Motif scaffolding. Structure first.
Motif, mmCIF file in Angstrom:
data_model
loop_
_atom_site.group_PDB
_atom_site.id
_atom_site.type_symbol
_atom_site.label_atom_id
_atom_site.label_comp_id
_atom_site.label_asym_id
_atom_site.label_seq_id
_atom_site.Cartn_x
_atom_site.Cartn_y
_atom_site.Cartn_z
ATOM 1 N N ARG A 64 0.827 -1.196 0.000
ATOM 2 C CA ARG A 64 0.000 0.000 0.000
ATOM 3 C C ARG A 64 0.866 1.254 0.000
ATOM 4 N NH1 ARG A 64 -5.112 -2.144 1.479
ATOM 5 N NH2 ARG A 64 -5.927 -0.141 0.731
ATOM 6 N N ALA A 93 -3.783 5.144 -0.437
ATOM 7 C CA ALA A 93 -3.991 3.778 0.026
ATOM 8 C C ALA A 93 -3.987 2.799 -1.140
ATOM 9 C CB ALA A 93 -5.294 3.667 0.818
ATOM 10 N N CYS A 112 -3.177 0.033 -3.867
ATOM 11 C CA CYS A 112 -2.479 -1.246 -3.913
ATOM 12 C C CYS A 112 -1.486 -1.217 -5.066
ATOM 13 C CB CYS A 112 -3.471 -2.394 -4.073
ATOM 14 S SG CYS A 112 -4.587 -2.627 -2.674
#
Ligand code: ZN
Lengths: 213, 136, 67, 25, 101
Positions: free
Chosen positions: E21, E26, E28
């Motif tokens: 992260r 945040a 991916c």
RNA sequence: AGCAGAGUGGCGCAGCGGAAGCGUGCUGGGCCCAUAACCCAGAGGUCGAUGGAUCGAAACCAUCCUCUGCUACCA
RNA sequence: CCCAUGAACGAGGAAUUCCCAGUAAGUGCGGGUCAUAAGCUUGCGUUGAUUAAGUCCCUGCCCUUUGUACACACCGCCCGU
RNA sequence: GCGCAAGACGGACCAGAGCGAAAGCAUUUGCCAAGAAUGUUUUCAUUAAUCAAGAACGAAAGUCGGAGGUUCGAAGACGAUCAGAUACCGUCGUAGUUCCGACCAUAAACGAUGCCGACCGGCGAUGCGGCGGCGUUAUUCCCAUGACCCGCCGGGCAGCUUCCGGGAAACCAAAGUCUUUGGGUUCCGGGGGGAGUAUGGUUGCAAAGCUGAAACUUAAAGGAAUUUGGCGAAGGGCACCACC
């Protein structure tokens, strides 16, 4: 509305007999009233103290945990509860282009102190080494972990609490590991990082007498 | 408020937990064990504007207030324990700790051992938000 | 508040570049007169010289950038 | 449109065609 | 067309790496694709060092540092100006920027 | 047929002694290369009517009128 | 030109123009139109300041790198009910 | 601050490093099974390469039946933003996310590059196995071993330079050895839409998967690279017809 801090009485806590500095500090508690007694309120209390402010002018990155059990009246005595390492040094050990090996053994002393020790060792880059790798094979890591397992197991069960604590004041287990384990791979950064209390035996006052004089 | 201690020769130690995030600051002072508090003031105590309560000036004012409280109560020396938000959110301390430490040192409060104690995870649960993150 | 901060006067040592959105502020390096060892940075509005002594209502903050 | 949502509306048309095929028996 | 010889990452013979992260976001992101920032800095930089050392109980005291690792997505790295775009012939340079202070 | 609510800018609404406003509609101007959003300004008011108390009421007093809430053709 | 007539206007909403030294501004005098002729324009002289020696935030300009489904050139092109 | 209870995951070490047919694989220890490469003056003697039919494995999501539900969180209930906002943002929150057992067989499942074999420049490193050699450490003598240094051999992931050579070019030591056109072998494409569409067959509980047209319409749709303009792209300078 009244000030609650006018009913506070300052106390004193004393380190055990393995430490040169006897006074640790002062704590306060509410004045007793009826059902709740101030002796019980100091039953479960943990202080986070450092070694350099407790023994002498030694290294300053090792911390100890101490818990009181009894009060003698403005005077509290404590016993060893755990050992942990200061964060900045521990994360200064870990850098890239090297491997780190961890181990953990539930071993107990001659009395009912069930411990839990953690040791970490870091691989040494040689002085004339040109290669940036400084890597190790997996079976060498397993052998080093087994050897550190045997070393931190052997120096415990034949020792009582006081001799284990006096062994923990220097990094003698780490020096004995890096002298013993350097036949397989040389190591430069070896210390025991964490000691925990899991099970505690019955509290009888003879040990708390002889561990403070 | 009155105690039989030595002022000139020795000193009294407490610890002070400075928790600083990007939304608020927490200047909390306790005893050496941490069980028993002394005084607790926050960044919402000094500024009533909700825009900048994690501002350095609010943390400075709260640190001077808690330094005055510890001076009138009789605490002379402090062990700094620094803290960020922790968890899976962030690890950088907030923009109040830098002013709070200087305001605690400037008031005449003696400083012992300083340390960062933040909750570090060994791969804890999932962070708030989607897979693509918060698009702004 | 409920506290009267005593007014301290400080003299500059070196002028830095001009900060601000429109470039109207200026970074200066001031030094205290009750103890001539301390040097902090403050934000000033208006023209300043070298050796120009400024009055300071507070002596605790530090200079922030253009924002 | 891109191929993804045109594909999705084609699948919805396929679905509606399938239910009218099964209920038109 | 093919912009880079690799794919802006460090995957050659794997096919799958563990995703991580972002810190600003945040998002991916795969581990070998994200921009890494292992920053070393003090608690007090250059102004409060004299105030800490002149109000300290202990003489000859070392100041502890902050050791954190920052994981950045590509858009968060460009928008925070950590890395900036280069010329086509200057894209191939792989050395880190030199440090002086 | 009997008791109560409402009567205020084109529309809906706030108000009870020193005293014509709100949301909306219309007109005009600015912003922009221009339009829509955004901002500014104004016109538009027998406060349903009569007489009186009060220095002074759209509000206080008594009556009527217009539309609604309940009884319903009660001989 | 002379005597009467004495309205609006009590320092101005949203917005916007010009300028940094004999400069803005106040003040008058020449020329152009002119048979009759300046509230405009171009020159001239008198009195004569406040603020600033910087910035790229707004409106734009110059160079390098990068991106583009644009080239009657973003006031472009384009997807769907 | 002290403990308790549940579930998920294994940071920093973690690299253009390793293994695996691919998808994929990261705490410690124990058990079982398998495999590449290296070494060999060991054994059978052509047992080989590619593959219609057929068969195994196959991310996430989706389905069926249990246990458990910590965090995150499609649909949904709201608070702001906006002319509108059932969107970006924030608070909760359903299926699902986790394990067992039965299903489907889909990805930008990419190195957008099928498999085997040969040839064709160098350079310095990397992981494994083997060999040789000045020297240092495991406390001073010897030997082998681990840990470094100097070189090679074989296989693997890669990197730098190149008028070998090729290509439309970007670029490629393979995408080379191709008009001077043939080493062997499987799949697959003939302008753009219609269209992976209608129908037929088939698999499946379902969602859907595989095979797979035509009528009609169109003179362009595309690939590489250069020069301008435009960026709510970046980095340096300037202007009172810009600002302070
Ligand atoms: Zn991000």
């Amino acid at each position: 509305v009244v000030d609650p801090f006018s009913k506070k009485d300052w106390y004193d806590v004393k380190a055990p007999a393995m430490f040169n500095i006897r006074n640790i500090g002062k704590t306060l508690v509410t004045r007793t009233q009826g059902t709740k007694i101030a002796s019980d309120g100091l039953k479960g209390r943990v202080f986070e103290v450092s070694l350099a402010d407790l023994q002498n002018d030694e290294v300053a990155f090792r911390k100890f945990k101490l818990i009181t059990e009894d009060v003698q009246g403005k005077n509290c005595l404590t016993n060893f509860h755990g050992m942990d390492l200061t964060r900045d040094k521990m994360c200064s050990m870990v850098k890239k282009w090297q491997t780190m090996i961890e181990a953990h053994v539930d071993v107990k002393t001659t009395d009912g102190y069930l411990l839990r020790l953690f040791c970490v060792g870091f691989t040494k880059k040689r002085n004339n080494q040109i290669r940036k790798t400084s890597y190790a094979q997996h079976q060498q890591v397993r052998q080093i972990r087994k050897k550190m397992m045997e070393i931190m197991t052997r120096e415990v069960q034949t020792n009582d609490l006081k001799e284990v604590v006096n062994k923990l004041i220097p990094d003698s287990i780490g020096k004995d590991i890096e002298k013993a384990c350097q036949s397989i791979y040389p190591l430069h950064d070896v210390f025991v990082r964490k000691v925990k209390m899991l099970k505690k035996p019955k509290f009888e006052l003879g040990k708390l007498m002889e561990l403070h004089g | 408020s009155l105690g039989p201690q030595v002022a000139e020769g020795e000193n009294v130690f407490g610890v002070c937990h400075i928790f600083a995030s990007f939304n608020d600051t927490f200047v909390h002072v306790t005893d050496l064990s941490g069980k028993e508090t002394i005084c607790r003031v926050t960044g919402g105590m000094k500024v009533k504007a909700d825009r900048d309560e994690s501002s350095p000036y609010a943390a400075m004012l709260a640190a001077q207030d808690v330094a005055q409280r510890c001076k009138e109560l009789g605490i002379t020396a402090l062990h700094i324990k620094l803290r960020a938000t922790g968890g899976n959110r962030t690890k950088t301390p907030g923009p109040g700790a830098q002013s709070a430490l200087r305001a605690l040192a400037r008031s005449g409060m003696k400083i012992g051992r300083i340390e960062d104690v933040t909750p570090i995870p060994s791969d804890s649960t999932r962070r708030k938000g989607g897979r693509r993150g918060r698009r702004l | 508040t409920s506290r009267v901060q005593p007014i301290k006067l400080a003299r500059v040592t070196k002028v830095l570049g001009r900060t601000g959105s429109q470039g109207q502020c200026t970074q200066v390096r001031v030094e205290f007169m009750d103890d001539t060892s301390r040097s902090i940075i403050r934000n000033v509005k208006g023209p300043v010289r070298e050796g120009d002594v400024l009055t300071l209502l507070e002596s605790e903050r530090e200079a922030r950038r253009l924002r | 449109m891109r191929a993804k949502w045109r594909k999705k509306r084609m699948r919805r048309l396929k679905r509606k065609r399938r239910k009218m095929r099964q209920r038109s028996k | 067309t093919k912009k880079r010889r690799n794919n802006g990452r460090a995957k050659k013979g794997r096919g799958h790496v563990q995703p991580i992260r972002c810190t600003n976001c945040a998002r991916c992101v795969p581990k070998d694709k994200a921009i890494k920032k292992f920053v070393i800095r003090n608690i007090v930089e250059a102004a409060a060092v004299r105030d800490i050392s002149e109000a300290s109980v202990f003489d000859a005291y070392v100041l502890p540092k902050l050791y954190v690792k920052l994981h950045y997505c590509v858009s968060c790295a460009i928008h925070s100006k950590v890395v900036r775009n280069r010329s086509r012939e200057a894209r191939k340079d792989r050395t880190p920027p030199p440090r002086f202070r």
